Design an enzyme around this catalytic site. Structure first.
Site, PDB file in Angstrom:
ATOM      1  N   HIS A  96      -8.337   1.604  -6.541  1.00  0.00           N
ATOM      2  CA  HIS A  96      -7.173   1.525  -5.663  1.00  0.00           C
ATOM      3  C   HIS A  96      -6.108   0.627  -6.342  1.00  0.00           C
ATOM      4  CE1 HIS A  96      -4.682   1.271  -2.120  1.00  0.00           C
ATOM      5  NE2 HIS A  96      -5.038   0.026  -1.777  1.00  0.00           N
ATOM      6  N   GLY A 132      -1.860   1.389  10.301  1.00  0.00           N
ATOM      7  CA  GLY A 132      -1.170   0.539  11.251  1.00  0.00           C
ATOM      8  C   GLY A 132       0.340   0.673  11.312  1.00  0.00           C
ATOM      9  N   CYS A 191       0.823  -1.191   0.000  1.00  0.00           N
ATOM     10  CA  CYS A 191       0.000   0.000   0.000  1.00  0.00           C
ATOM     11  C   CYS A 191       0.866   1.254   0.000  1.00  0.00           C
ATOM     12  CB  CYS A 191      -0.841  -0.018   1.278  1.00  0.00           C
ATOM     13  SG  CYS A 191      -1.909   1.388   1.494  1.00  0.00           S
ATOM     14  N   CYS A 235      -2.854   3.949   4.008  1.00  0.00           N
ATOM     15  CA  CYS A 235      -2.413   2.745   4.682  1.00  0.00           C
ATOM     16  C   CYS A 235      -2.646   2.916   6.145  1.00  0.00           C
ATOM     17  CB  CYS A 235      -0.946   2.434   4.461  1.00  0.00           C
ATOM     18  SG  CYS A 235      -0.371   2.469   2.767  1.00  0.00           S
ATOM     19  N   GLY A 269       6.026  11.029   6.392  1.00  0.00           N
ATOM     20  CA  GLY A 269       5.977  10.013   7.420  1.00  0.00           C
ATOM     21  C   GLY A 269       7.332   9.454   7.757  1.00  0.00           C
TER      22      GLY A 269
END
Lengths: 392, 392, 392, 392
Positions: D348, D380, D88, D378, D279
């Site tokens: 997607h 987790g 992802c 995405c 990130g």
């Protein structure tokens, strides 16, 4: 010895490749035609002694496809069954095998014919079990390898049809005109109801809904000579054979109840025709004498008949080139051949095809009051299969 | 009704799974056996009227495997050939079919038998032609699906053997003692040369050398009851059936030359045995009134014989539990059963196995001067196949 | 700009095709190497910021093989991981990517390297999803397609090696002497324990026992020039490249712990070497003005070094012809090249190979007290990958 | 260190599974988007230093799919390229990798983004190389195994979406209303031309004819809440996730030209936005502190921003349940989210998706004059990928 008769003769419609019967395994088609042949003959399933069904693409169909068809038809589980593969010959050779077992004194009532679902043929990985080790390999079309590929010459059946067209000068035009006539004759036959007696519907229970398939779907209604002349050769650069003048890949089952004359009498059956002779019949000498389609020739002679005396003839149309070669050599009257259209229009479901044309022949003899019939298919020494019928 | 005889009877060694015959297609094993069978009968290839051969795992083997074997053996291309699939019954049913065709007056000399190479069976992708769409699917082991899986009950033939063990109350211990006896008799027969007459060598010609395969590979010499007792169940938790009390997966061809007595005399052939009767012989009323092994009982009855009169019996060992159930029901004297070992030791090359035990019976009758013999295999309604032989 | 160092460097043995590591998925080889690399660096799993691993044959290995290896090694689930595929360059490019991420200020500790198991690569059916429709197709060997086949020129990487042999006029004899020297040096290195520090054992736990794999399997001990001279060309008729002068198909994982110098000091780690420069370093004007091995020349130039100043060089041996072309162009002193043997002897586990030669270089620098080292592999525009190391 | 900007941002339309782009390999989609991104940025292909492209289903695509895309786009053959797989994350993580390489001083101009053609994913035979030996095995859907299946939990991604819906009480109704709004917003966006700036047409040269695909085909125009309420759960008996409230299987490529601010100035490029943070950015402590979507949270903090200050947000819609969970936890203003519709409507295409939403974000900021943008996808620990943009 015993006289042998056809008590009933039933087939499914013939589906086109990937179409109307794509979801119906060959064994279920077989089961549908067996159940109905048994009712049409007016005998009980327990009166049946043995089941003999042709089926060429048996890959992954599970143990003994003929037995599965018998069981699925509701025949007693203890009736023995066997599946025969003679490629093009299979479905008709089961009828002569039936007559031979009856003649030998070992049965009185046999289910014969054949079944095929070419749309459902698998692909194969031949070296999956012990490994490919390394390198690209072939993902095998099982329909082509086991049904349509010449194991000796290592080329497609279509190449053989080209060879015959070549050697006899059967021109592209002549093959297309033959294909057009088969198309027109099938269209008239379908529209005039000529197949209504012999077709058993197939019922497909859909996601929700039941679908009924009861009509031959391969014919191309409204075909024209112009439409056929535009097609590209399918097998060979500048060849004569096309999609248009060859049969298709098709799905069908066709089943006949074969009985001794004496048992038909005993069970109150009114038979449709007597089997007079067949390609496998008697023995030699000498084989080569008659020419290249000697199977059919010798079968005609054994009945004590000539080609002129025949009233109706089913001569299979795998390829128009091969059909024209046989008709030329045996000097068939073309008005008596494939009167309801032939395989170019209707389809060539390999393992069922010999039985299909026998089913179409016997009903056409009944309809048209024709006394002497010939069914013949396949070409070349060792392979020709033929049966002669005389109407009751 | 013509008398029918066995003029020769020949087989390859039986190879073990993935081992000595892994590189030799079934049709080549068949060609090797046919060529030798014809030679042993003392006839010419031209004297053969038809070729009828059992073969169960036909997937991807190409058009008409029987015809391929016939051609690769040197037989005239015009000899008709067909491939029969009755699973377990295939190889013996072709012998009785041969006799029926001969009895019907249609042939004098027929090559019959069977061929199988389980080591070479493919895997299948059944939905590759029109697509899987999405989601994992089954990569199908074709040997299991077409040769070993009960199409109705949706389980392995091993499970049927387990149900029969329960039905007839046959213990693990009983099955392993029976297996051990098959192993010992096979070892003694091999070492004493009892198979030397019937085995034709298979010559495997590699890129660099030649390998000769001429001995049955499957027996486990020096088997012991303790060794069998340690085995894990093959088919179910706490099962009685193990790899040591069931046959294997194996490769073989076995062919016989079947002739009318009249032709054999005309050709100077000294026949090995006469086929007296078979489970297919005469019609079926009331066939199930005998028990579950009624094909075998009915064949013996049709010979005009009884079990006590038989001199030698080959009763196939697909599973010890099945072999023992048939033997208890029919009250066989076990000293006359499988005297050179059976399929637990020797292997079960499906479409050849019925012919392979006939080849072993007829050679054993000659060597031991035994007049009356029985070959029987398969179990259950309509599957059992049996032939009775009388030594010439 | 942060200084970047190698804190540990560990690899599995290199297995041969279908042999010692056939049962151990690439992700498990990777997990074994990571767990040991972390231990050798003397850091905790929690100290790792990111996992970046080369892997070329990812087909069917499941989501994010690098993340799987990371998780199976005991690393916290929250550590981000990515799988890189630059074919031949994959395993070394992850080390320079690690250094770039560290230089950019975004991580202090990165697990880098590569993993491959060529023995476990699948075969593919590319048209299974929407269907093949009809006709045989390719069952694709995925190792060849994704790892070894030139996607543009539509031929094997072996053919490129043949073109390079012709280009640079490198003889069969020259290639085999080079191969023989790699074999001899590998044999002497193994026997003298030169790999003992860098190899982590792989423990294969079967149903019944445990097997330890801790030695490189691929070298052919006792190789001879005569033995090499007898080999048939691998790629083309009359080719110079054979199986004996090209590397194999092999299985390995090789992982390094890459850290900023500052973190290494903070964590008490004694680093093995500093990464001085790499072929990716600084921008590209005018990059092709050096020759065809300009990644390697440009890396050496960016270190401020020259070829003569290097103490040890690992220059990968996918093919002897390529190894010799690079060595002639760059004028390497061959006494300092591949001192413990190269990929002809030791194998070429594609997505691990670049990291495996870095692991071998850094251990060899330690053992031999060599200050300056070069690892280089791959050939051709934009593929070459190189790193320069300076011993701490 | 260096400021990093987006000079251009281009994507193909997103095709639906088995539909408009089924015949266009991922690499050709990639090539089409690269060629156009390069023209839109107004730089020369030779100004490009490296290519970094995400692609998850690489099985049988041939060596180094990113390199094939580069070459097919007409980029110089010597530009190095690598293919990244983070499932992802892949397509967006390539943009932050680009920024990291630029920050490290090693490039000035990188092509980033990703490509996927899920319609073309193969099926796999994992044990074809060394053999299956015996028994049915799995014919592997490679798209499901490598793209959609949780390697650790051994269940579908859809199960994870269910778990989140469960744990947060995100009801079926709430997910369908979210899905409806995404559908309506995509329909308005498409019909109002909002994607015209960012879509590059794909040209499919048909049998004869060229076809142009330039419109997103996945949205279901005219969707209604009633239509969505009727759907059956797709993953779990009585679950909340359906086809209707989840994205599809889709094909796309999306590519961005990433450059240093200083090189953009030098080449006369007018950039679209500056990358402010991401990130992957900076390092620790401490990771767990922020809650479960800490990736995105920490990225927002690093830019010196709050969620309220954001002008536009692209938050990927793999499953409405997951989108609603992230929006709830970070307290997004839903009027600023997915303003042109999201993945439920649009598709997607795994390896391209992160880049696709960044392309839609940057053009929407340009169009709507929005200063601060967030792209996030995405869920987790370890997996969240996020980028913050500030418009030029």
């Amino acid at each position: 010895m015993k006289e042998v008769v056809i008590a009933s003769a039933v087939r499914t419609a013939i589906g086109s490749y990937g179409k109307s019967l794509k979801d119906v395994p060959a064994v279920d088609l077989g089961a549908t035609a067996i159940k109905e042949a048994v009712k049409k003959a007016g005998i009980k399933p327990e009166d049946v002694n043995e089941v003999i069904l042709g089926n060429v693409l048996q890959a992954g169909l599970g143990q003994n496809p003929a037995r599965q068809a018998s069981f699925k038809a509701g025949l007693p589980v203890e009736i023995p069954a066997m599946t025969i593969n003679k490629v093009c010959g299979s479905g008709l050779r089961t009828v002569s095998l039936a007559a031979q077992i009856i003649k030998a004194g070992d049965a009185d009532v046999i289910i014969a014919g054949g079944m095929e679902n070419m749309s459902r043929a698998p692909y194969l990985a031949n070296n999956a079990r012990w490994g490919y080790r390394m390198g690209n390999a072939k993902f095998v079309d099982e329909m082509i390898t086991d049904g349509l590929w010449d194991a000796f010459n290592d080329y497609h059946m279509g190449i053989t049809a080209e060879n015959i067209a070549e050697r006899w000068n059967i021109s592209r035009e002549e093959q297309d005109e033959f294909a057009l006539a088969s198309q027109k004759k099938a269209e008239e036959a379908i529209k005039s109801g000529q197949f209504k007696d012999e077709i058993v519907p197939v019922v497909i229970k859909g996601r929700k809904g039941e679908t009924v398939v009861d009509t031959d779907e391969h014919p191309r209604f409204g075909s024209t000579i112009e439409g056929l002349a535009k097609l590209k050769p399918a097998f060979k650069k500048d060849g004569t054979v096309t999609a248009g003048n060859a049969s298709g890949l098709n799905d069908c089952a066709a089943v006949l109840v074969i009985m001794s004359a004496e048992k038909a009498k005993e069970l109150g059956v009114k038979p449709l025709a007597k089997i007079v002779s067949y390609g496998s019949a008697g023995v030699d000498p000498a084989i080569m004498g008659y020419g290249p389609f000697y199977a059919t020739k010798a079968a005609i002679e054994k009945a004590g008949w000539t080609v002129d005396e025949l009233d109706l003839i089913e001569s299979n149309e795998a390829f128009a080139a091969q059909s024209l070669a046989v008709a030329k050599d045996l000097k068939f009257d073309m008005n008596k051949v494939n009167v309801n259209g032939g395989a170019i229009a209707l389809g060539h479901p390999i393992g069922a095809s010999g039985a299909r044309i026998l089913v179409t022949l016997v009903h056409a003899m009944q309809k048209r009051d024709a006394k002497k019939g010939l069914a013949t298919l396949c070409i070349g020494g060792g392979q020709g299969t033929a049966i002669l019928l005389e109407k009751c």
